[model samples]
Target: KRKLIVDSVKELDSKTIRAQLSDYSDIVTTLDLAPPTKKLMMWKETGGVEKLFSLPAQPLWNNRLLKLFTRCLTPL
Candidate 1:
């Protein structure tokens, strides 16, 4: 792997991004994104207590289980 690499991360949605700010409503925004060709992976290394909620490695992807466990991230 190269020392120089770039990756994409998404919305930490701000007021304008959330569209909750009427004052900025007049602003027009345009986005052009290249659709990802590869499966998404964490840009940062794993740490913290998150490992308890992570899925085990599999040969195939598991969208169904992923969706279920994503909900596990929230504490009831």
Candidate 2:
């Protein structure tokens, strides 16, 4: 398998929960056990998930005022 399953996330803002991970191995640190070794470096590295980008702000473009302001009768 070429996928990394992750769920039950902590300190993260997610709307979907989908991961089939049952067990883990080869980890140098555990959340409730020791520590992340380096909090600054670790988070700055992976940013929690090794994939995906910052969630797209779905409201800015969805606003009526914004749409009306940006749309100016196709301009002349």
Candidate 3:
């Protein structure tokens, strides 16, 4: 059976989680380790359960924002 089974702690994120949800998988083991918060966040972010998954996927956006904001506002 094509089911995503996460054991222990595996390197997983929104992208990979989206894939697992797409393909057929039991995902019981995954559920065991992965918290509901994570699953829900991923599902919601990737629009798997719905098309309203709008997670701020912009790290650089914040990085630059803080960097510029601080450097400009703070003593140079």
Residues 1-76, model 3: lDDT tens digits: 7589868866788898788888865644453444358778766555652333222334335665646544654353
TM-scores of all predicted structures: 0.22, 0.16, 0.18
Best by lDDT: 3
Off by over 4 Å in 1: 1-44, 54-60
* Residue pair clashes in candidate 1: none
Between candidates 2 and 3, the one scoring higher on TM-score is 3
What is the lDDT of every predicted structure here?
0.54, 0.46, 0.55
Writing each residue's lDDT as its tens digit, candidate 2 over 1-76 gives: 6588776655543433223233335434666654446886545554554222332223244566556644753365
- Stretches of candidate 3 exceeding 4 Å from the true structure: 1-11, 25-76
Whichever of 1 and 3 has more TM-score, that candidate is: 1
